[PDB]
Amino acid sequence: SGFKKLVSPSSAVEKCIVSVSYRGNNLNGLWLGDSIYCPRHVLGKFSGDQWGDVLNLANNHEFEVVTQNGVTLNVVSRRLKGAVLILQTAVANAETPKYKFVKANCGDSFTIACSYGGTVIGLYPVTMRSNGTIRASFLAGACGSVGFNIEKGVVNFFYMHHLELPNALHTGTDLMGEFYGGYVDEEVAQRVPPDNLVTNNIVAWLYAAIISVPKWLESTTVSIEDYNRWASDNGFTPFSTSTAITKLSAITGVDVCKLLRTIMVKSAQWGSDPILGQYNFEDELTPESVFNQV
């Protein structure tokens, strides 16, 4: 069968990506209906309340919005929503898909449309970490790149890229302009809480390991209460019930409490016998994705 970390097809999203430039600053925008969303730092490197004042002094014609077809979209209004700039255009994107702005929770996995100059050059999966960051791949010019997925014919937009933190960590806002992890769009030092391995995804992965075929599967159970008590002190998110996990448990006939025990045991010492070829927990394969591939 095989288990992979899938990315959502990008046809729908590609039609909404546009180029946005202001006083030499160029990055990517999201074009839905008659609105264009992009990072407010396209205005320059400011802080605190400066943003609003800067935008007040700006002119709508200073904003250069260009589609992938080469069409320039005149801006008729501008406003700030959190750290996101929203520019209204006179022309609407006739190819706007059904969509929804959703905030990603820790462990949620989605697709990043890595974009440069208003064009999507590639895609890859990411998972919202417990500290509000994602481990992605972005270079200068990638700001404004969006994170999304597609469920039941709707495009869910979870993220817009804004900055890189030390140790190749990335963060940004949801499409409402709110920063994940409470970070800010300023080039100053920022504290990043420790990254906690995502238990629910690890469980999903262990179920995948079971299905694909174990000597590593612990025979004893540990209560969810005790594991969670333990997790809070060992860098692991709490285990939380989920339908996909219950179905995986049903498919294999293996109680999740045994996978939780397996996590505690191998967290202390893995030794060897590898699980699916590795000696470290896979944290970004979700219960839903694993179930979908069964």
Binding site: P39, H41, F138, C143, H162, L163, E164, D185, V188
Partner: peptide, 5 residues
């Protein structure tokens, strides 16, 4: 420490 894309 942070870098704006």
């Amino acid at each position: 420490x942070a870098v704006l894309x």
